[PDB]
Amino acid sequence: GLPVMNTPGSNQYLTADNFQSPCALPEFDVTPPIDIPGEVKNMMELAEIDTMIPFDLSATKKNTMEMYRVRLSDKPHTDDPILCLSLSPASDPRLSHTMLGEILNYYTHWAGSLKFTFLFCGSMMATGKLLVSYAPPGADPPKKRKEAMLGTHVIWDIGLQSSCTMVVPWISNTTYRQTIDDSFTEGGYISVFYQTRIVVPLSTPREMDILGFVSACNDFSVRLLRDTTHIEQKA
Amino acid sequence: GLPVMNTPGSNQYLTADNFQSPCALPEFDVTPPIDIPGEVKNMMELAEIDTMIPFDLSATKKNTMEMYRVRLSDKPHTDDPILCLSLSPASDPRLSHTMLGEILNYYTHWAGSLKFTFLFCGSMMATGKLLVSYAPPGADPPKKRKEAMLGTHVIWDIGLQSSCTMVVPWISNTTYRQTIDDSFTEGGYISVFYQTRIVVPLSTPREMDILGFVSACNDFSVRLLRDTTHIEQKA
Amino acid sequence: GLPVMNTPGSNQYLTADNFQSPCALPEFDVTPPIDIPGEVKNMMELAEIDTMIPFDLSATKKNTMEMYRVRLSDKPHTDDPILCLSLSPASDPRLSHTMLGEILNYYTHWAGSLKFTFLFCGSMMATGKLLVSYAPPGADPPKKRKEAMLGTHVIWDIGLQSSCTMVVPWISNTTYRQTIDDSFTEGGYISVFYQTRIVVPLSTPREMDILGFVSACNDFSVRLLRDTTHIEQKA
Amino acid sequence: GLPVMNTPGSNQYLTADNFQSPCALPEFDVTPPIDIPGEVKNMMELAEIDTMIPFDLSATKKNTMEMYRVRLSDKPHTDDPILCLSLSPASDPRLSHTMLGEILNYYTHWAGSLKFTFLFCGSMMATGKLLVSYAPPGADPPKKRKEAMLGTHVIWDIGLQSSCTMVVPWISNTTYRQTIDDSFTEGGYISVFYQTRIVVPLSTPREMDILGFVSACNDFSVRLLRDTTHIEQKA
Amino acid sequence: GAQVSSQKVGAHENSNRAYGGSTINYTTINYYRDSASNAASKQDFSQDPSKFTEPIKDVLIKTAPMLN
Amino acid sequence: GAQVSSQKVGAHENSNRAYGGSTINYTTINYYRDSASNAASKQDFSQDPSKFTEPIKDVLIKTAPMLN
Amino acid sequence: GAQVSSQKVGAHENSNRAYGGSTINYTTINYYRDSASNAASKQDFSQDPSKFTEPIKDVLIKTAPMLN
Amino acid sequence: GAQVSSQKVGAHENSNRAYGGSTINYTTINYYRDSASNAASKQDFSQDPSKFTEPIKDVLIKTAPMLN
Amino acid sequence: GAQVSSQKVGAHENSNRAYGGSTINYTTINYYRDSASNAASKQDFSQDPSKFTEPIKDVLIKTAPMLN
Amino acid sequence: GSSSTAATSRDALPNTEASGPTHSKEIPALTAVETGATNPLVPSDTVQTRHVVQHRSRSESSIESFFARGACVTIMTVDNPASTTNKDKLFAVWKITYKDTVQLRRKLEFFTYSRFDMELTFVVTANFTETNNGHALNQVYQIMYVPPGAPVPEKWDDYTWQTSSNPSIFYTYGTAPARISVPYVGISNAYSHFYDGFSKVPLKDQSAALGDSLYGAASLNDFGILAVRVVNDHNPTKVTSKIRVYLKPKHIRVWCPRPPRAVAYYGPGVDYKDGTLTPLSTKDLTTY
Amino acid sequence: GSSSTAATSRDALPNTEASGPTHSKEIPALTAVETGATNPLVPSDTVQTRHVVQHRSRSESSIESFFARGACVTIMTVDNPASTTNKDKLFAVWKITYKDTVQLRRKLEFFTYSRFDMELTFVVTANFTETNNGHALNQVYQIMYVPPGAPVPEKWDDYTWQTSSNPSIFYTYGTAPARISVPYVGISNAYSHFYDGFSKVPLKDQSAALGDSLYGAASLNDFGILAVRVVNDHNPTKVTSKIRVYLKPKHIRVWCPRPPRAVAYYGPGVDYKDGTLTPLSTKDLTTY
Ligand SMILES: CCCCCCCCCCCCCCCC(=O)O
Numbered sequence A, B, C, D: 001g002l003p004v005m006n007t008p009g010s011n012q013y014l015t016a017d018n019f020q021s022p023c024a025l026p027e028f029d030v031t032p033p034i035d036i037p038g039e040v041k042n043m044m045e046l047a048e049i050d051t052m053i054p055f056d057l058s059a060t061k062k063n064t065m066e067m068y069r070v071r072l073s074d075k076p077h078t079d080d081p082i083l084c085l086s087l088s089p090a091s092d093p094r095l096s097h098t099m100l101g102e103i104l105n106y107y108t109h110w111a112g113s114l115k116f117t118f119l120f121c122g123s124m125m126a127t128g129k130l131l132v133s134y135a136p137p138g139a140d141p142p143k144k145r146k147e148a149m150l151g152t153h154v155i156w157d158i159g160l161q162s163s164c165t166m167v168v169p170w171i172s173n174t175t176y177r178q179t180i181d182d183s184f185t186e187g188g189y190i191s192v193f194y195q196t197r198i199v200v201p202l203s204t205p206r207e208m209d210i211l212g213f214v215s216a217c218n219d220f221s222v223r224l225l226r227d228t229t230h231i232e233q234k235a
Numbered sequence E, F, G, H, I: 001g002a003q004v005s006s007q008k009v010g011a012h013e014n015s016n017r018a019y020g021g022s023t024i025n026y027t028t029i030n031y032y033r034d035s036a037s038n039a040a041s042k043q044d045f046s047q048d049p050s051k052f053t054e055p056i057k058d059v060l061i062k063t064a065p066m067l068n
Numbered sequence J, K: 001g002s003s004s005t006a007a008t009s010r011d012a013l014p015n016t017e018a019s020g021p022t023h024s025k026e027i028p029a030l031t032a033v034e035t036g037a038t039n040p041l042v043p044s045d046t047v048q049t050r051h052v053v054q055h056r057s058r059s060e061s062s063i064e065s066f067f068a069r070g071a072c073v074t075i076m077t078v079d080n081p082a083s084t085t086n087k088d089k090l091f092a093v094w095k096i097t098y099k100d101t102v103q104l105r106r107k108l109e110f111f112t113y114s115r116f117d118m119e120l121t122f123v124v125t126a127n128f129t130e131t132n133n134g135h136a137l138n139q140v141y142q143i144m145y146v147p148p149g150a151p152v153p154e155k156w157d158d159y160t161w162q163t164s165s166n167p168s169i170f171y172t173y174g175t176a177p178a179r180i181s182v183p184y185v186g187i188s189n190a191y192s193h194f195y196d197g198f199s200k201v202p203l204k205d206q207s208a209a210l211g212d213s214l215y216g217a218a219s220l221n222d223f224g225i226l227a228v229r230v231v232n233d234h235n236p237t238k239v240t241s242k243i244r245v246y247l248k249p250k251h252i253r254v255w256c257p258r259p260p261r262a263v264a265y266y267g268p269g270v271d272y273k274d275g276t277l278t279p280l281s282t283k284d285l286t287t288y
């Protein structure tokens, strides 16, 4: 026979291998594909779709439809935050179960720009200006508009175009970040503030909700496939 | 030796494999073929041959020559069925032991059109019109001519051409059906009715038989080879 | 290393295999051939050589020089046989230990034409005509000249050409026969009769011997190598 | 992986094999050769060098310098031998420890011509004629000049060219001889006789020595490598 | 002495610069002198079933009366 | 019937007369007639996400008002 | 340094676009320097049996008397 | 897709019609798509040590005074 | 990068359309970068023994007197 | 160097053509099965059809593919007992056949005649039988093909196991199942799955006993035997082993189709046994 | 690169030609076996024949194919006992020959002389012998070829097993049977299966004892010995092993055909033994 010499690795089963193997059903008459609508070629296509953020995970709102509603009101101007969220897309509880977060939990590393879009759901008669902010990490997390306004931000004017997008540009020391809470690869702070105040005329609801959505930009990628902690099978 | 590394599958014996192996009788002087009549190249050639259906499997007729005879008579017109059969060619007891059925029991999946041909065996003086029907599944199985007549059907006029063929066109949701009784891949209903009635003159038998045959059309195929339940070896 | 996958047959030793193997004496200075007379290229060359038949295996003649001598005499014409032998070249006791028979006992199958040559060893003054016969199988084996004369035969006139050959043409239902006694592949009957009678003048021996020889023709072949029952080693 | 099937021989270690194997010191900076005088390319080059024969292995001379000296004297002519030796170069005790003999004891077979050269070490005033003989085997070994003179021989005249060579031409039935004492491949007899006598004038030593040497000719070869019995290691 | 043949591809991977599309071939080399040692090629032929389905001496024209 | 393709090299060894630089290729030969037996080539295609991200009938121009 | 030779095919599979017909060859490569290591090729010659069956000095013409 | 390269031969066998002399080459074929799977080629480059031994802004001329 | 060389055939099988005669070659491919890993080729040279058998300064003519 | 590759088994079946309403003297539906022919209709002969590009093929029901599987044809038992046993060391002898089991036999018997190369694969298993703690070293088995006429072994260790000419496989326990191929070895131009005849003509002039033979039997199918032994000498702890033989008919041609076996097999011929003759179950004529 | 490939062993034999009635002075049937020739007839010389295209060949009876099988030529016993044994560890010594068994010997002896390369395959089996529960670890065997003249081992562990020059095989128990090839190594131009002579000429002038030697013996066939040992040190539980040696003569030529051995072998020469000289059985001259 041809002289051969077995190397290390011989007879192992690596579950990530990629080898040929004999067919148990030779000459099977395979059914051809049809052109089904909705084919997907890459998981990042799903990450580019806006999905809604469960912002309010208070003890009574978490795990109910109310977790998605951020309540605003026509109260006098304040510089205090409407919401505060950490840019940890696979591990902050508000982002980790969005479609982007749930795909990032099958990978160890993420990189690229993200975007947050907010939808105003008050009445047509309600007006207002809000400030949406992203502060890259390393300083006191913004708790007042004065600090949030110094980072990346969009001042949103509410009106006929119902929604507003803030892009979180990829700003990072490492070339990829971890998909777990980690200080070395921390991403910074997202916050929303009242810029002026919500104003309504009489006979109008004085309280209303905004909804927020997150999606990846076209420069976004992930790597190092891994199992997720989001499902388990006990016994 | 050439460095090699064994992969999974090494040393297994897959009974469906297709490998080379050393010859125990090298340089054997093989006897050449002769041109024997009747060579077969594909099992579906056998499925295209008409074979006779054991339609009447009553407790006293089953397993006797009488199971193949469908008795008709010159009785007054009725809309009630002469016979009722399910289009389950490998598992309805009337079809599963025909040559088509017995080949389909070596495969898991079947697809394509079928055809039923009936032979009138009464006297030359007997006349009549019958209605042969195929109703694709999903509605009440036809028990009256009124319903059977709404599906695929052939009205057979008895006469010098002794026989009549109804084609069961391949009409199916799945691209292949199972060769077992299964609702998801059910095939529908075959039935025969009196269209007018059998009429005979005097001095003529008033009762007579028809024989039915089934065969596959040229668009018929099977796949996923499997063992049959039609033979066993106990101990 | 190159990814490989062991198949069935791996590590077996098939005694009929034909593989390469490492040399235990590399660069050995091999002695060259010389042109020795008598080289043989195929065992059937040996089967084409006439060797003498032990025709008379009676209890007192078997295993002695007398077994090779067929005794004739000048007795009055009879239609009764001088000898009777079955055409089973590897298993009839008279043929199986001839060179043809002993080579056929290393093979399972034989095919082709054979030939029997008889040598008259009486005095020059003795004359006679004999009938040598081959009857292909399926009828009563010839015990009288009347029946033997209906098959393949040669009438031998004794004279200056001392010997006479009868060819047993390959006449067989199967394409090869078994090298054991077997009815399905039986070969038929060889017999010799007096055609007129042996005649001698006075002062001449009235009894004398003939010797017979068998050899294969150029259309003869064997196959399926096997061990012989003609040698053993007890304990 | 590529389907493979292990043959016999797999995993054995044949000490005469010749395979590749991984290097334990990859990219080692090897020291280059220099042109050292005295390179040898084949062991038979050493066999072609004259080395001295221990002819006299008497109980008191063996294993001393005296074993190499063959003593002659000016005694009256005799036809009796000065020395007698068998042509068994690897196994006669006088030849087996010469360089030729010790190389032949690493091989099973030897073939070719040999040569014996004798050196006269008497004084310049001593003269004489000797007869050196080789008798190929199969007859009474020569013990008298009369018989030795009938085989291959050289009559040596002692004089200014101090030495004389007799060639033992390869004369053998087999194409190679064994390197052990063996009758079938025996080589014959070497002997030396006085042809006239040694003569010296007065005031001259009347006894003196000759030394003999053996070497292979350019047609000499050996084969089938084997271990020698000339070295051992007890426990 | 390699035999290169094409595969009939059933499920195609998302690839046409390596798998699914640009005809995927496979290679066979016979290692033995005896052809009985060979694997099966499975490159087999079909035939018309007529010697079993229509063994009648005079040709069947299906649109015509079989008996005439 | 070998398929030769190129590797996308990540870490490069200090070498450009053998490894890192002069395009490193790899070889694939299929051993089986059934394409289901094949390894995955991983030479896969991407597509625009628009059928999910922008399934609207009238084209989205991002610099313009979405509602007009 | 491959040797390609043809097989004498006995049973032929139903195939002439891969097996039975278009001459089936096989391949041999010797792996060893010593020819004693080689497998047997079995490509052997036959000869006329005459040196054993007809070793007579004057040629045998079978239609003629052997003794004349 | 074989890579053939030469070996730097250290000890040479007594041979120049097969080993020692007429450049001995070796062959490499990569079996995997990922270049991390590759063996090391060891065909590596050297460089001048100057970025460590002479990191001075004005060029060192060794025959000259270093300080001038 | 295969080396093909010829074998010196000792016993020849009855064959000249495959074995014994039409020069039988064998193939070698080195799998390793280090030449120490190579098998021995055994394609070796001989030399004249003169540096040991005739190391004399003035040439030996055997038909002549060695001392003159 | 490289060779590169008329209806084939994997070709797509015919497309359905669109067909519309009809009113004419053409009568595809009427026929006469008395002729012995099957009516060659397709759906467009009796209903309106649309156009359909057909992609299905009959690739898996070619003769080769229908038979491309190893099937178990026998189980052979052997053992290696202590030397102190009263009982002889068991070696096995099996007359080669596909008729000792039923599944492959039924598939081949869809046809009257066949030609094929045979691949045999051997699966070997072993076990201890006496509730003892003694051990055994790895066994080697000899599988010897003894063709008709060769001496059948009478003892596990007699001279016949020398195998100078019979082919033998020495299989090592725990390695990949052994495997060999054999050519088409029939003494006829095809193997006969059915032989309607005898091996002897009984003659009037001969006793009935002398002219008698079994119906349907002939050496057409005598292929000899496999003889199997454990090569290892006797061991103090007894080990028993089984060799399962799998047959795959490859490179196969078949002729003259037959109705498949419908009642249980009963010996190597077509005979049937009382009490097994009712394959069909009860079903009423007008019940779906 | 690729080499691609006068009567050959697998060529079809000659066709039968059609021949009709005859009446003439041509006399194929009459002959004279005194000449030493066999009459070269074919059936058309003595009967009417039809034309037949002959397809049979003599491919399996070429010399190479007749001998293309490994045959057992010896069984060697070795063991590995406890160190406390009174008995020495058994290593085996076998003088290489094909005459210790009978089947290959009889086939080679259809000829007087032969030339071939030899393939040796080694099947190794082992077992426990004392009804004990103790165990043993996997054994390695050394098979050393000791050519004539080399020191034969006297102990399982003496210096000769160093094998610096003898070829040795170290075989690991449970792996594929070991195998090597050897060239034609005869000291003659062909191996002699029969040598009608002596290795010594007895001389008148010498004692009879000094000139004596065995009839038919010569170093033509002394090939040395195989020496085999279990390399593992002594173990508390004794294991016994057997090495079966199989010889296949490949690349073979043979000369001068002989009648095959017809009575039992009796030693390494052609001698026979009383009581074995009756190979033929009883059969009456006029009985079929
Ligand atoms: C060492 C293994 C040797 C195997 C030997 C196989 C011997 C030939 C077997 C022929 C199988 C025949 C199958 C069809 C039988 C039939 O005619 O009904």
Ligand SMILES: CCCCCCCCCCCCCCCC(=O)O
Pocket (backbone or CB within 6 Å): C024, K096, K097, K098, K118, K120, K143, K144, K145, K167, K168, K169, K180, K182, K185, K191, K192, K193, K220, K221, K223
């Ligand atoms: C490590 C294994 C070495 C094997 C050594 C084989 C030694 C040569 C054997 C020659 C076998 C001769 C067979 C024919 C004998 C004869 O002349 O009768």
Ligand SMILES: *C(=O)CCCCCCCCCCCCC
Pocket (backbone or CB within 6 Å): E001, E002, E029, E030, E031, E032, G002, G004, G026, G027, G028, G029, J001, J002, K002
């Ligand atoms: C055609 O056969 C020539 C191309 C050779 C390609 C490499 C062959 C791979 C190894 C086959 C070894 C010989 C098998 C007995």
Ligand SMILES: *C(=O)CCCCCCCCCCCCC
Pocket (backbone or CB within 6 Å): E002, E004, E026, E027, E028, E029, F001, F002, F029, F030, F031, F032, J002
């Ligand atoms: C294309 O395939 C021709 C080049 C062949 C290169 C060598 C093939 C290596 C061995 C493949 C064996 C066949 C696998 C079933």
Ligand SMILES: *C(=O)CCCCCCCCCCCCC
Pocket (backbone or CB within 6 Å): G001, G002, G029, G030, G031, G032, I002, I004, I026, I027, I028, I029, K001, K002
């Ligand atoms: C001729 O030999 C050149 C074609 C080479 C084809 C591939 C060789 C397959 C591996 C052989 C390795 C060397 C064996 C010692």
Ligand SMILES: *C(=O)CCCCCCCCCCCCC
Pocket (backbone or CB within 6 Å): F002, F004, F026, F027, F028, F029, H001, H002, H029, H030, H031, H032
């Ligand atoms: C370049 O690669 C073409 C030359 C091919 C030579 C033979 C390849 C040897 C086997 C490689 C198998 C594929 C490895 C995944």
Ligand SMILES: *C(=O)CCCCCCCCCCCCC
Pocket (backbone or CB within 6 Å): H002, H004, H026, H027, H028, H029, I001, I002, I029, I030, I031, I032
């Ligand atoms: C020269 O080497 C090019 C011809 C390649 C023939 C096939 C190579 C066989 C496999 C070698 C693998 C690489 C070894 C590290």
